[PDB]
Design a protein around this ligand. Structure first.
Ligand SMILES: COc1ccc(CCNc2nc(N3CCc4cc(OC)c(OC)cc4C3)c3cc(OC)c(OC)cc3n2)cc1OC
Ligand code: NA
Ligand code: NA
Length: 204
């Protein structure tokens, strides 16, 4: 990816634009993401603890939304839609997110990522080296028309994929950490692949 050129991806749920930028704006708190590459060369992705569809429903059922929730969330909704409800369609859905979190503008991007990666990983991830390229990710969700922005950098970590296979049940942020290639059927797979490919190629 070249400085300030933008690439656009569409999924059934989102329109996302990905653009290389020089500096993250520091007028407000922002969100920063890590494209994390394990020591054995696998790209990592997190499964968000709560799905975006369920969070949207809570903050406000369309059946397109029932295709994009976790099964425990669905059971909570169906217990209310059907009286003696004992099961419902399970879409085998996971809400894929890059690891990372909030950057106020006290801290460097690097200290922020080290901290958030260690909290989201139950203190297992440590960063061997960072990349130098920052990508701005702008998503517009199609169902609720909300716009969300975050900034992504490469993190080459010390741990192997296998090191990160289990995640504590008390992890408030993510249900698990996995390889992105274990998510090929997810509708975010194309643009997440692009992010990793661009950040790794820039590193090389
Ligand atoms: C209508 O009412 C609401 C609705 C939602 C919400 C949740 C807002 N929080 C939030 N939203 C995000 N988006 C954008 C993407 C997206 C995608 C969807 O499908 C794929 C989607 O399907 C429905 C909704 C969203 C909202 C985020 C995106 C991220 O990209 C990586 C991220 O990184 C960690 C964190 C994000 N956090 C609050 C509402 O009430 C105020
Ligand atoms: Na589930
Ligand atoms: Na995809």
């Amino acid at each position: 990816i070249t400085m300030d050129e933008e690439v656009i991806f569409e999924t059934p749920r989102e329109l996302i634009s990905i653009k290389r930028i020089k500096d993250i704006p520091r007028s407000k708190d922002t969100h920063v993401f890590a494209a994390c590459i394990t020591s054995d060369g696998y790209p990592l992705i997190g499964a968000r603890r709560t799905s975006f569809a369920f969070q949207a429903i809570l903050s406000q059922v369309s059946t397109k939304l029932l295709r994009f929730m976790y099964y425990n969330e669905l059971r909570e909704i169906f217990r209310r839609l059907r009286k003696g409800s004992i099961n419902n369609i399970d879409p085998h859905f996971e809400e894929l997110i890059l690891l990372g979190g909030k950057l106020d503008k006290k801290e460097s991007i690097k200290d922020c990522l080290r901290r958030e990666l260690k909290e989201e990983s139950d203190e297992r991830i440590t960063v061997k080296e960072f990349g130098n390229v920052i990508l701005k990710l702008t998503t517009r969700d199609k169902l609720f028309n909300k716009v969300y922005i975050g900034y992504c950098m490469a993190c080459f970590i010390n741990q192997s994929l296998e090191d990160l296979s289990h995640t504590s049940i008390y992890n408030v942020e993510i249900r698990k950490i996995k390889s992105l290639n274990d998510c090929i059927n997810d509708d975010k797979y194309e643009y997440l692949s692009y992010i990793y490919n661009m950040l790794v190629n820039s590193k090389l």
